[PDB]
Structure formats: C-alpha cells, structure tokens
C-alpha cells in the first residue's frame, strides 16, 4: 500500500516560566519513531521504534541539532506573532508545524505537505504544487512575502520530494518486520437489547494495523442502510488499533443485518452475523 | 529524517 513519513512540531509559550514547551514527534505511517521534548532530561532526539535504533551516532546528533533549531525558530516566531496580532505577554500561545511526504504502492512520491498554524488555526500552508502558499490573513501574507523572497517553497520541495521520500524508503526497508506488517483485525459481534422491541448489535475490530479501516452495516444488502454509532478509531497502546460500529435493530429481523469489515490485512472483506 | 532546509521564521 501507500506510506507516509510525517513530522509534527508544537511550541507553547509559558509567560513567567521563561522558555516555551516544545514537543516534536515523527511517524512512519501510524508508527511513531522519534520524539523530542524540551522538558525531558536528555535534550536529545530519542528513538520510539526498534528499527530506528540502528541509526548511528552521526544520525542522532544531526536530528538532535535540527530539532533544537526548529524549537528556537518557533520561539522567535512566538515573539513575532505576538507582535503581528497585537497580543500581550500575559497569554499562552501555540505554534504548530507539520510536514511530510506520501509514497504509493511502488514507493514513488505521491505528494508532499508543509503547514503551519497559530493558536489552533491555519496560518500558512504550502499548496500541493509545492510552489504556492495559502496565507490565512494579513499577518500570514507578510510571512508569505518573506518566504517567497527566500525561496522557501523551493527548499521544501527539494526536501519533500527528495530527502523525505529517500529516507521513508530506507525506514520501510530497515523496519520491514514492523512497518510492512499488516495485522488483520480480530473481530466479533456483541448483543444488547432494550428489554422490549429493538436491540443493538455492536461489531468489533481489535488488534489491527494500520489504523485505516471501514466498518459498514448493510440491511438485506447492496446499499449501506443503517445509521450506526461508530467510535473514533483508537490506540490499544501496543502499536495496534481498535474500533466498533453499532446499529439499532428491531428484536428479531437481526439476520437482515451484516457487518462489513474492510482492512488492508484482509484478502477479502469480512462479514459477521449475530450467533447466540 | 527531519527537514534541514526550508525552515525559516515567520
């Protein structure tokens, strides 16, 4: 299937405490592989997956330098943005940045992205042509002009289409046992009535990876026809994910409903039915 | 591998 590599950066100002809190994390698909936290003791980019641990000290030192540089850049930004929005030094504010690349089933570049937010709202983002900028307001227009003059988009394009993809492929190969593995969901259906009339059937999906899944309810067939209560896909904590979908059906006539579980780890879509 | 170019202040 397709794959991605993404880095997420958050800086939060802390009036009266000196320096902002900075947290960076990196992912390959749904697997976190690095982290940096400004409040931790190491002051190093740290491994969070087994296969990245084999990178040598040159790699770790470099990643640590770069992540610290991102941190200090955001810290300057926090000051500049406070000015652009005419804010005081009393409030806590947040800067976020995210970037990365997607590759298809052939591991060739599909798309890249680089986006920035202030106080939880879009500030500036690179469009998919990896050349144009979308600026949210007058402040972001000023940033856009500065970044256009410095050819930031050209720099990011060289990283997103070249470096990002080359390293994503390397990681995919080094951690093949982890990242190229597909854990098919373990499924089962649950039963809950309401003393009389209609009941609720809950179709479960557990221990699956990647996170992308589709739990659909059909009535009789063909058309997906049942307003189901589905929870957000959620992490188990062991590297796998969980999800369910429930429909309200009249007592009896339960056999008219079939749960359709779709996931990459399944050669063919799966179908469950309530069995006492 | 994090970006080592294209990261400037706003």
């Amino acid at each position: 299937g397709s794959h991605s590599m993404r880095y997420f950066f958050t800086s939060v100002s802390r009036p009266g405490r000196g320096e902002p809190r900075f947290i960076a994390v990196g992912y390959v698909d749904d697997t976190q592989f690095v982290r940096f936290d400004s409040d931790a003791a190491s002051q190093r980019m740290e491994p969070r997956a087994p296969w990245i641990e084999q990178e040598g000290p040159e790699y770790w030192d470099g990643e640590t330098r770069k992540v610290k540089a991102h941190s200090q850049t955001h810290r300057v930004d926090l000051g500049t943005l406070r000015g652009y929005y005419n804010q005081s030094e009393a409030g806590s504010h947040t800067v976020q940045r995210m970037y990365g690349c997607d590759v298809g089933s052939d591991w060739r570049f599909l798309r890249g992205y680089h986006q920035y937010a202030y106080d939880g709202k879009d500030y500036i983002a690179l469009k998919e042509d990896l050349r144009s900028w979308t600026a949210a307001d007058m402040a972001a227009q000023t940033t856009k002009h500065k970044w256009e003059a410095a050819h930031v988009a050209e720099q990011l394009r060289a990283y997103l289409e070249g470096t990002c993809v080359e390293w994503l492929r390397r990681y995919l190969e080094n951690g093949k046992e982890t990242l190229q593995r597909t854990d098919a969901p373990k499924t089962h259906m649950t039963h809950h009535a309401v003393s009389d009339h209609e009941a609720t059937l809950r179709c479960w999906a557990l221990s699956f990876y990647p996170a992308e899944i589709t739990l659909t309810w059909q009535r009789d067939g063909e058309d997906q026809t049942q307003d189901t209560e589905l929870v957000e896909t959620r992490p188990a904590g062991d590297g796998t994910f969980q999800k369910w979908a429930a429909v309200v059906v009249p007592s009896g006539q339960e056999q008219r409903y079939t749960c359709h579980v779709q996931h990459e780890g399944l050669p063919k879509p799966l179908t469950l039915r309530w069995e006492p | 591998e994090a970006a080592g170019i294209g990261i400037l202040t706003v």
Partner: T-cell receptor
Amino acid sequence: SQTIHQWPATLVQPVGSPLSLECTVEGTSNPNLYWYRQAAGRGPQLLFYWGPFGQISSEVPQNLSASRPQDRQFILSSKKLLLSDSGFYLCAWSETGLGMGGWQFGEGSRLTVLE
Amino acid sequence: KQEVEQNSGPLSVPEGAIASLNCTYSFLGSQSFFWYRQYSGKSPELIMFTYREGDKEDGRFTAQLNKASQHVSLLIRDSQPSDSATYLCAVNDGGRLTFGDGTTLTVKP
C-alpha cells in the same frame, strides 16, 4: 546589508594566558552564530553552534568556552591557554532557522600560543 | 577528513582553462552543499551553495551535485591567476556546516 566582524585579528600570547575573542554581526536578527577553529592545511572544525537562545551543539573543546551576551555579540574565551590552542579562529553566522541565508565568516582571529 | 573528502592538490591549471574541483561526502542526510574560496592568510569566502541535483551557474562558477554518488563539484571557467586559492567543500549535516580539508589550486599565468 549584513556584515560580520571579529577582533582581534592576530594575536601572539604565552602559554597560560587568558584568551578573549569577539564577534559581532549587523543587519540581521536572531542569527545562528558559530565558532570554528582551523589548523594549517585543514578545513574549519566546529567548536560551538548557538541559536539565538543558546547553544545547540559543541564539539566540547577541551579548554575553550563560548558566550552570547547579546543577540549579535558572540565571545570565545579561555582562562589559561595551552600550546595546542594555536589556530585560526573563525566566527560565522546563518539566518534564523535552517535555511540558505548567511553562512558567512568574519575575518578570523589568528592565534599563536608560545612556549 | 572522512566525512568530507577532497584531494589536497596543489593542482595546476593553465590560465584560460577550466578548473574542476571535486568533493565526496559520507553523511547521507546532507541537504545542502557549499563551496568557499580561501586565500592565503584570509578567512574563507562563500562562492556558492546548492540544495538540488544538477548544475548551478553563477558567472564563471558552476557547482554540480550528484546525490546518488554523493559527489559535489565546482567548475571554474576562464581560470585566472587570481583564482589561485584553496577551495573548501562543506556539507550541511544538520544546523551546521562540516568541511573538507580543501583543494589548493594554482593557476599558471
């Protein structure tokens, strides 16, 4: 227009004497600042790399320390020089962030430590 | 210096000819590349930089990058005696520059 300037330009000192080198920049704000040392026939080797708010990396030089008392003032010091501290000391700057602006050296400070 | 390798020279080039300076690097995560010129008794001066594959020309200087062979080069057209100097290659290996030891070039008048 940006300029980077270092002082003193050349110095001859005895072993055991203190060292103080200064570097200043103009025309840019919150720059990255670097101290490098270059030996004869070799390329500059990094000693310290400071972002606008503090040190980001250093090759932990044995007998040198750096400080950045102001945004555009960078100092390299030693309390008591060793013979091995002779070299060509170079200050450089780069624009805030990780980009292509700057990467320029000052004039350098040539230090000869004598026994 | 194993991270960035350059032949030391001295390399002689006749005035008017093209001088070719070569550099190889071992740090695979290098994302930008730089050439400096250093005259005797002076600090290095930035000639140019590049962050993409292929050629980049600035007047008489052309920098070339081949990332698959980790090779960077600098070509100097219409070489002049005033081009005599040591040329330093540097890679950005994350927030900083790492240098090779340079190639000393002498352009014969």
